[PDB]
Scaffold this active site. Sequence first.
Site, PDB file in Angstrom:
ATOM      1  N   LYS A  35     -27.340  47.025  14.032  1.00 37.55           N
ATOM      2  CA  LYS A  35     -27.826  46.468  15.289  1.00 37.55           C
ATOM      3  C   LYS A  35     -27.053  47.003  16.503  1.00 37.55           C
ATOM      4  O   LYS A  35     -27.651  47.196  17.567  1.00 37.55           O
ATOM      5  CB  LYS A  35     -27.768  44.943  15.195  1.00 37.55           C
ATOM      6  N   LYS A  54     -17.964  53.349  11.273  1.00 39.80           N
ATOM      7  CA  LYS A  54     -18.983  52.536  11.925  1.00 39.80           C
ATOM      8  C   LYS A  54     -18.714  52.549  13.433  1.00 39.80           C
ATOM      9  O   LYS A  54     -17.610  52.214  13.875  1.00 39.80           O
ATOM     10  CB  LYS A  54     -18.980  51.119  11.361  1.00 39.80           C
ATOM     11  N   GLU A 103     -14.030  52.021   3.910  1.00 45.40           N
ATOM     12  CA  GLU A 103     -14.263  52.641   2.615  1.00 45.40           C
ATOM     13  C   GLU A 103     -15.725  53.045   2.489  1.00 45.40           C
ATOM     14  O   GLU A 103     -16.637  52.285   2.856  1.00 45.40           O
ATOM     15  CB  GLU A 103     -13.869  51.626   1.529  1.00 45.40           C
ATOM     16  N   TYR A 104     -15.939  54.263   1.988  1.00 43.49           N
ATOM     17  CA  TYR A 104     -17.283  54.726   1.667  1.00 43.49           C
ATOM     18  C   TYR A 104     -17.668  54.276   0.253  1.00 43.49           C
ATOM     19  O   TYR A 104     -17.028  54.655  -0.741  1.00 43.49           O
ATOM     20  CB  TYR A 104     -17.345  56.254   1.825  1.00 43.49           C
ATOM     21  N   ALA A 105     -18.740  53.488   0.174  1.00 39.59           N
ATOM     22  CA  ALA A 105     -19.273  53.075  -1.113  1.00 39.59           C
ATOM     23  C   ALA A 105     -20.519  53.887  -1.380  1.00 39.59           C
ATOM     24  O   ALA A 105     -21.548  53.646  -0.739  1.00 39.59           O
ATOM     25  CB  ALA A 105     -19.591  51.575  -1.095  1.00 39.59           C
ATOM     26  N   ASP A 148     -21.046  34.494   3.243  1.00 40.67           N
ATOM     27  CA  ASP A 148     -22.348  35.188   3.351  1.00 40.67           C
ATOM     28  C   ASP A 148     -22.568  36.093   2.149  1.00 40.67           C
ATOM     29  O   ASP A 148     -23.055  37.225   2.279  1.00 40.67           O
ATOM     30  CB  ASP A 148     -22.417  36.009   4.647  1.00 40.67           C
ATOM     31  N   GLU A 152     -27.545  42.093  -0.446  1.00 41.22           N
ATOM     32  CA  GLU A 152     -27.428  43.193   0.496  1.00 41.22           C
ATOM     33  C   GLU A 152     -26.003  43.372   1.007  1.00 41.22           C
ATOM     34  O   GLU A 152     -25.722  44.413   1.598  1.00 41.22           O
ATOM     35  CB  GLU A 152     -28.369  43.008   1.687  1.00 41.22           C
ATOM     36  N   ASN A 153     -25.113  42.390   0.790  1.00 43.17           N
ATOM     37  CA  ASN A 153     -23.710  42.507   1.170  1.00 43.17           C
ATOM     38  C   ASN A 153     -22.828  42.933   0.016  1.00 43.17           C
ATOM     39  O   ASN A 153     -21.607  42.785   0.088  1.00 43.17           O
ATOM     40  CB  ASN A 153     -23.214  41.162   1.745  1.00 43.17           C
ATOM     41  N   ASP A 166     -19.317  42.849   4.591  1.00 39.15           N
ATOM     42  CA  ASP A 166     -19.831  41.954   5.627  1.00 39.15           C
ATOM     43  C   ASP A 166     -19.046  40.659   5.768  1.00 39.15           C
ATOM     44  O   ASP A 166     -19.518  39.593   5.382  1.00 39.15           O
ATOM     45  CB  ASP A 166     -21.298  41.633   5.444  1.00 39.15           C
TER      46      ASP A 166
HETATM   47  N1  LIG Z   1     -18.737  51.572   4.137  1.00 39.70           N
HETATM   48  C1  LIG Z   1     -19.989  51.876   3.823  1.00 39.70           C
HETATM   49  N2  LIG Z   1     -20.274  52.772   2.846  1.00 39.70           N
HETATM   50  C2  LIG Z   1     -21.553  53.072   2.547  1.00 39.70           C
HETATM   51  N3  LIG Z   1     -22.607  52.534   3.183  1.00 39.70           N
HETATM   52  C3  LIG Z   1     -22.432  51.608   4.175  1.00 39.70           C
HETATM   53  C4  LIG Z   1     -21.071  51.238   4.564  1.00 39.70           C
HETATM   54  N4  LIG Z   1     -21.155  50.321   5.538  1.00 39.70           N
HETATM   55  C5  LIG Z   1     -22.481  50.131   5.785  1.00 39.70           C
HETATM   56  N5  LIG Z   1     -23.239  50.911   4.978  1.00 39.70           N
HETATM   57  C6  LIG Z   1     -24.732  50.960   4.935  1.00 39.70           C
HETATM   58  O1  LIG Z   1     -25.288  51.192   6.235  1.00 39.70           O
HETATM   59  C7  LIG Z   1     -26.290  50.203   6.532  1.00 39.70           C
HETATM   60  C8  LIG Z   1     -25.993  49.535   7.877  1.00 39.70           C
HETATM   61  O2  LIG Z   1     -24.671  48.982   7.854  1.00 39.70           O
HETATM   62  P1  LIG Z   1     -24.229  47.702   8.739  1.00 39.70           P
HETATM   63  O3  LIG Z   1     -24.660  48.073  10.141  1.00 39.70           O
HETATM   64  O4  LIG Z   1     -22.732  47.607   8.560  1.00 39.70           O
HETATM   65  O5  LIG Z   1     -25.014  46.558   8.141  1.00 39.70           O
HETATM   66  C9  LIG Z   1     -26.297  49.158   5.419  1.00 39.70           C
HETATM   67  O6  LIG Z   1     -27.579  49.052   4.780  1.00 39.70           O
HETATM   68  C10 LIG Z   1     -25.255  49.616   4.422  1.00 39.70           C
HETATM   69  O7  LIG Z   1     -25.864  49.734   3.134  1.00 39.70           O
END
Ligand SMILES: Nc1ncnc2c1ncn2[C@@H]1O[C@H](COP(=O)(O)O)[C@@H](O)[C@H]1O
EC number: 2.7.11.1
Lengths: 277, 277
Positions: A35, A54, A103-105, A148, A152-153, A166
């Site tokens: 967002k 991010k 961290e990259y997941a 939460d 999705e989290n 999250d």
């Molecule tokens: N650290 C992360 N590693 C991999 N994917 C992520 C990570 N953080 C967020 N995402 C993906 O990016 C999308 C948007 O992230 P967010 O704005 O943090 O909700 C989500 O659907 C997550 O699946």
Amino acid sequence: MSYSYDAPSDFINFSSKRQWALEDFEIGRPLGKGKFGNVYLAREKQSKFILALKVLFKAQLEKAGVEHQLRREVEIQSHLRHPNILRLYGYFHDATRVYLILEYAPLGTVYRELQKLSKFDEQRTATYITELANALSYCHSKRVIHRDIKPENLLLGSAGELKIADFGWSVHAPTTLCGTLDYLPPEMIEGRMHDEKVDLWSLGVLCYEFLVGKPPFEANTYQETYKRISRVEFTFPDFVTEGARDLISRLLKHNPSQRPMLREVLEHPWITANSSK
Amino acid sequence: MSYSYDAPSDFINFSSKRQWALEDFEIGRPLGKGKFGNVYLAREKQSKFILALKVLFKAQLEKAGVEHQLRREVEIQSHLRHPNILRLYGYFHDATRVYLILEYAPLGTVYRELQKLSKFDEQRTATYITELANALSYCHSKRVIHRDIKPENLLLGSAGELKIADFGWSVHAPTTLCGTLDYLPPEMIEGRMHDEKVDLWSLGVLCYEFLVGKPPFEANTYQETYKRISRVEFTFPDFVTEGARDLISRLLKHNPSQRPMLREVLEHPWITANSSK
Ligand SMILES: Nc1ncnc2c1ncn2[C@@H]1O[C@H](COP(=O)(O)O)[C@@H](O)[C@H]1O
Ligand SMILES: *SC[C@H](NC(=O)Cc1ccc2c(c1)OCO2)C(=O)NCc1ccncc1
Ligand SMILES: *SC[C@H](NC(=O)Cc1ccc2c(c1)OCO2)C(=O)NCc1ccncc1
Ligand SMILES: Nc1ncnc2c1ncn2[C@@H]1O[C@H](COP(=O)(O)O)[C@@H](O)[C@H]1O
Ligand SMILES: [Mg+2]
Ligand SMILES: [Mg+2]
């Protein structure tokens, strides 16, 4: 607004005080759109360490009035270090943007995994509940309640390990307030939204969703879902086994004090009969 | 630990950029002691304006783990401007201390006024309830819930009007969280401790204490007080009039959603018959 958080901004040597700078990162492909800004795959230049950056726009955070929420999320998550909690290594900010170094997941969300497989077998379910209960036990030892937990989290690491993400709704659990109960309403004395047992209910919902492929109070209107949650009205498909029903029913109690401790989940015989973990 | 709050630190011309410094103030007699420092009468030197300076010790705040609570208190209270809310003009800090620059309330606490008089007549009571309801209506308009209203937290201005103080437990309660109810436990859906109705209960307790001289759930153990609050068990001495009984009984409802709106308190026939405001 002040972007001075109680959270680290020190440069980290990922191979084994200077503060982070945007120039520390080679910014690669977008991983997702949020967002207030996107998440990018990135590399720290000196170490070539792969991470997720991010990027959030200050103007947008302030217009929406969510900047103190971001501050709390960053302060909480950046002090949690556990293999089943997504790491927040640090943050930094410049004139227009706030940057979270995460961290990259690499293997997406449990939400996606459930979409693909429809439901999980009991081994995968018990393993994931073990990982979540370990992560939540660690949170609760830091007096952190997540509040939460949902598919999705839950992100997946490269070996398929769960990563709780999250922390935007998390709180740091427990004065003159309680020295005098005489002026407090029932809901301030009970403090249920600040009770660690919040997260135990979500574990029961997840265990059910993992096995059945839909959550137990699902309805096509909010009002019917809230009604069923309030009555704790739900049913099991015939295929859910008795051991799974026992655990789920123990977790889904309206009175939070009746829900089990996380140690009792980890030690439940259906969990230890089925977990890889 | 960061003492950068989203709260003002700029010098103010009280007769009618530069940040506050301790040397802007003359210090007077101590007004009171707290577990984290003391409150002094003080005077800003250029204007000679009398105020209160609350001095808190960083080492004590950090040891107790309450520094983020102070940050929230200062951020909330410094953005409220109402004649029945104690003003927080700004803050500053030095190597060891945090300083809050507060409105001085010269007539003391309502707590001390109850010790002196034992109980209040209906006119004094209804006037205080009007002021309190006005202050809480303003707070709720700013999406602030106070959550710790009690006689020790009600100070008295030069004209004898109430000043709500102590925003240490207050919350600003303005979303993906509620987008889906399916994973939330009942206490997170209901969010009772974040409901503005919290403060309507305390208004009922205060109205009772003002008229009677004892709070309605008083008991000689905490466990018994909690049981009386939880069961809403209270009774009135015979002198309490029908109008006051009606108002108090309407306010003291276990379910926050059954408590009245503040407009209904301000327009209650007992209030308008007895309040000088
Ligand atoms: N650290 C992360 N590693 C991999 N994917 C992520 C990570 N953080 C967020 N995402 C993906 O990016 C999308 C948007 O992230 P967010 O704005 O943090 O909700 C989500 O659907 C997550 O699946
Ligand atoms: S005040 C009694 C106390 N309850 C809490 O501390 C809950 C609470 C209240 C306010 C908060 C908060 C948590 O975090 C933010 O502000 C207590 O004694 N609780 C235990 C208890 C509950 C019910 N019955 C007996 C004991
Ligand atoms: S999620 C439904 C929503 N409840 C809240 O917003 C309460 C809440 C939750 C989490 C918080 C918070 C407040 O402040 C801090 O984090 C809602 O719509 N509530 C009203 C409602 C309840 C039940 N049925 C219908 C409406
Ligand atoms: N702004 C003020 N004006 C007058 N008295 C105050 C003020 N703030 C605090 N006090 C008094 O100082 C004592 C301790 O304050 P506190 O640390 O806020 O609990 C209390 O007894 C209050 O009566
Ligand atoms: Mg801020
Ligand atoms: Mg701080």
